[PDB]
């Protein structure tokens, strides 16, 4: 049952696991100033990036407890109870509009608050599948916070470099990925196609399978090549289609 806890009494380790991984493994944990069961992941062997996090909350951001390297690397999240939004296309095929546009919004907003965070956080690793659900009937959140610091790639991340409308791309390509239940680029195979498509500024063909005019043209938008040209997250959440309802 209970084999661990952090320095402080805080967060109680039990003995069950609740997710593997090639780097990642879960276990249930427990919050033992609020008896809430959370997530606590030990990563196989983040100074200022456990400094941000710790101290970060947002109705659309998992939220990210503690972390520190036991004696591998351990954090205790929320604990996520729903499956992602890869899952979620699978379970249902396709997503309506209603939908659609409400999750949107919501990672926009999740994605807004750590640009603006001082300094900013860049995900930087953003996907349908660390993209979490509430409920059936509920809100999402952007999960996998701590991670990205050990396709989706805005093309001037191959030059590694990396700048807030990185996540900008992503998010087109997720709201792509949830208006064509596929995996972007999948006409493609290997990376270095990709590459090569997505540096000659050649959209994944997948875009061509989306219905909604509008959401076709943020998508667009989201995915240019040179970033300066990239909408913000202010133009993003301005368009007709995230003001209309």
């Given at each position: 049952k209970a084999v661990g806890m952090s320095n402080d009494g805080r967060f109680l380790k039990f003995d069950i696991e609740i997710g593997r991984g090639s780097f990642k493994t879960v276990y249930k944990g427990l919050d033992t100033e609020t008896t809430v069961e959370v997530a606590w992941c030990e990563l196989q062997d983040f100074k200022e990036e456990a400094e941000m996090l710790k101290g970060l909350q947002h109705p659309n951001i998992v939220r990210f407890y503690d972390s520190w390297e036991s004696t591998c690397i351990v954090l205790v999240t929320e604990l996520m109870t729903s499956g992602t939004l890869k899952t979620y296309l699978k379970r249902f095929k396709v997503m309506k509009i209603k939908v659609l546009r409400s999750w949107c919004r919501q990672i926009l907003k999740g994605l807004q608050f750590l640009h603006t965070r001082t300094p900013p956080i860049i995900h930087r690793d953003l996907k349908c599948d660390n993209i979490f659900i509430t409920g059936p009937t509920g809100s999402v959140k952007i999960g996998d916070?701590?991670?990205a610091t050990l396709e989706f790639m805005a093309p001037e991340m191959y030059e590694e470099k990396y700048d807030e409308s990185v996540d900008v791309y992503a998010f087109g390509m997720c709201m792509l990925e949830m208006a064509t239940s596929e995996y972007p680029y999948?006409?493609?195979?290997?990376a270095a196609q990709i590459y090569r498509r997505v540096t000659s500024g050649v959209k994944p063909?997948?875009?061509?399978?989306?219905?909604?005019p509008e959401v076709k043209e943020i998508i667009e938008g989201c995915i240019?090549?040179?970033?300066?040209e990239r909408y913000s997250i202010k133009d993003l959440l301005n368009h007709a289609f995230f003001q209309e309802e």
């Open positions: 916070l701590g991670l999948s006409e493609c195979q290997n063909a997948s875009f061509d399978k989306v219905a909604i240019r090549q040179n970033k300066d």
